[PDB]
Amino acid sequence: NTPREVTLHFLRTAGHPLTRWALQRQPPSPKQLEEEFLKIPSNFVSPEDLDIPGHASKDRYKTILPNPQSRVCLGDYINANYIRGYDGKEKVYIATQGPMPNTVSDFWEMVWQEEVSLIVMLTQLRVHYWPTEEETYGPFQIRIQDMKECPEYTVRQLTIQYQEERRSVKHILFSAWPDHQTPESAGPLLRLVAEVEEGPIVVHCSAGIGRTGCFIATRIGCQQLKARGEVDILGIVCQLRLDRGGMIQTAEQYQFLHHTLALYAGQLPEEP
Known part of the structure; x- marks a missing residue:
């Protein structure tokens, strides 16, 4: 299997760092971005x-599986992977499917064991693994402390209890992202990212x-732009594809990412 290795070598070496100026004022044409995306192997x-x-009945899709090297282990099985963050730092995120009815207890177990304090849910409105007020899911009790509704997302403050210990989790449900x-715009997405800046961060859809x-x-890209005034979007996507196959599905989603990040640049505090 050299073909696996050609694929892995690309993911480790590809890169197209853009200056802030270039990103904002002279982006790669939509066609250039498609081509670039199309070369990115799925993994x-x-x-x-x-x-x-x-493991089959704990995945929602037969063709979407967790990579073994990065697989999260319930200390049996969950469709989830550790994801590297800014500069390659290990375990900044856990990406996972939205729970299934038979994987709900596992999800909370994961949240506990990995010491998760932050969960981001990306969906589009009209299964609930969190209650209206309280209930138990296996050995864990969940109680919601606080609910605040925003345009595009709902912020749920909650606690989790196992035996005689209690932990606070922030849960954010983004509801304006169709599969x-x-x-439709990028502003609400950036606000959500700003909300995430308040153990691994669970993210799921x-x-x-x-x-x-x-x-x-988008997080990592914003982190790059804030720190260095440059962003390497290709490389970011290569890095994720290394941790879980298929991160970022369509060319369009990849075009939007450039857009989301051009907006982040333009909105960084300056002086008139």
């Missing part, structure tokens, strides 16, 4: 190359690759 796991018995698509991939690539 999906084969069902045969995962070899962990009876396989992008939000139905499959846990398309929108989950876009959100995370």
Whole structure:
């Protein structure tokens, strides 16, 4: 399997760092961005190359599996992967599918064991793993402390209890992102990112690759732009594809990412 290695070598070495100026005022044409995206290999796991018995009914999709090297382990199985963050720092995010009815307890177990304090949900409005007030999911009790509704997202303050310990989690539900698509504008997305700046950050959407991939690539991109005044979007996407196959689904989603980040640049505090 040299083909696996050609694929992995690309992911590790590809890069197109853009200056802030270039990103804002002279972006790569839409066609240039498609081409660039199309060269990015998927890095999906084969069902045969995962070899962990009876995992099938805890995935929502048969073709969307957690990469083994980065797989999260319930200390059995959950469709989830550790994701590297800014500068490659390990474990800044856990990307995961939205829970299934039989994977709800596992999800909370993961949140506990990995010491999660922040959960971002990306969906589009009209399964609930969190109650209206309180309930128990296996050995964990969840109680909501606080709910504040915003335009595009709802901020739920909650606690989790296991045996005789209690932890606070912030839960954010973004509700204006249609599957396989992008939000109509980028502002609300940036506000959500700003909300995330207040153990690993759980991020999920139905499959846990398309929108989950876009959100995370947006955080890191913003981090890059704030720190260095440059962003390497290609590289960011390569890095994610290394941690979980298929992060960022469509060319369009990738175009929007450049857009989301041009807006971040333009909105960084300056002086008139």
